Design a protein around this ligand. Structure first.
Ligand SMILES: Nc1ccnc(=O)[nH]1
Lengths: 176, 174
């Protein structure tokens, strides 16, 4: 595998992917390639392009676990170009072979990882540093009527933190 | 104030995008794109390629564009650090051919720049660890990848001894 291009690994949870971005470095700093449509298309993927936002999280924030319900369900693509997260996702697709399973990955500017998540995946993260940036794209726009979630502490994960900072909204999500 | 504002700029087909910010005890989130709001102005998010650069203080990168038929729209924001983003209209049938504009982008102003095909784009980094996230509507095409020399179009860069690649140092003058 050539370290000059974007490399994509489909994960045990089908429809989710680790994306490993290359880097070019010189006296000016760095350039990192995060998406290329031809590369993505081999995996049957298109970049989510309905909405984008970025979050800036204090240390020990947990945000999640979030997803949008059919028929406004969407693919989601995240990377962390500053700070660090432990990114966590749970397969909540009832008819999935990995239903109720989860995976997690540390994302940061050092490893240059992105995660692509299919529809029906619940997504969250733990900010492990102040000023942690997560840039996030979704394949359908935010749907207040279908926006949903599962409680961060309700699906078997062992979060390496004490007294995480968590929204009231996130605190009142239903248990998986 | 609470939603994405898009304003057309003097150089036509180019737009200033001003993102809203929402805050709580956890931090902030900033909406950079929504397809419907973009569509309200005739735009679509460039989505063939994305990359981000991280630049030391006093770096200049540019001026870059891709040539027809692989010319592309370009969208940039700065979520960390600061840049003076600069662009040149190089479209010969344009009423603003040869004119340029410049805009400070940073995470406080939350400004993004959308650029039309046929615009040469570059920036000057004003802070270490400056992040630019860039999207293009066609993928990189090395055969059509081209440029105009940063010091060749009238601009007074507010920097002494900028740090510039060999490539960029030897682009054709405008
Ligand atoms: N994919 C790329 C985009 C822009 N510049 C590059 O060198 N490569």
């Amino acid at each position: 595998h050539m370290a000059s291009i974007i490399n994509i690994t489909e994960l045990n949870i089908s429809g989710c992917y680790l994306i490993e971005s290359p880097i070019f470095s010189d006296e000016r700093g760095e350039f990192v390639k995060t998406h290329h449509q031809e590369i993505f298309k081999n995996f049957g993927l298109e970049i989510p392009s309905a909405e984008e936002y970025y979050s800036r999280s204090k240390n020990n924030v947990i945000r999640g676990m979030h997803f949008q319900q059919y028929p406004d369900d969407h693919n989601k693509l995240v990377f962390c170009p500053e700070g660090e997260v432990l990114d966590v996702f749970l397969d909540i697709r009832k008819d999935s072979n990995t239903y109720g399973q989860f995976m997690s990955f540390i994302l940061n500017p050092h490893n240059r990882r992105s995660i692509f998540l299919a529809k029906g995946i619940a997504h969250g993260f733990l900010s492990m540093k102040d000023n942690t940036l997560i840039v996030c794209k979704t394949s359908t726009v935010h749907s207040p009527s279908r926006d949903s979630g599962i409680h961060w502490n309700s699906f078997g994960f062992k979060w390496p933190v004490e007294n995480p900072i968590i929204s009231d909204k996130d605190r009142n999500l239903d248990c998986f």
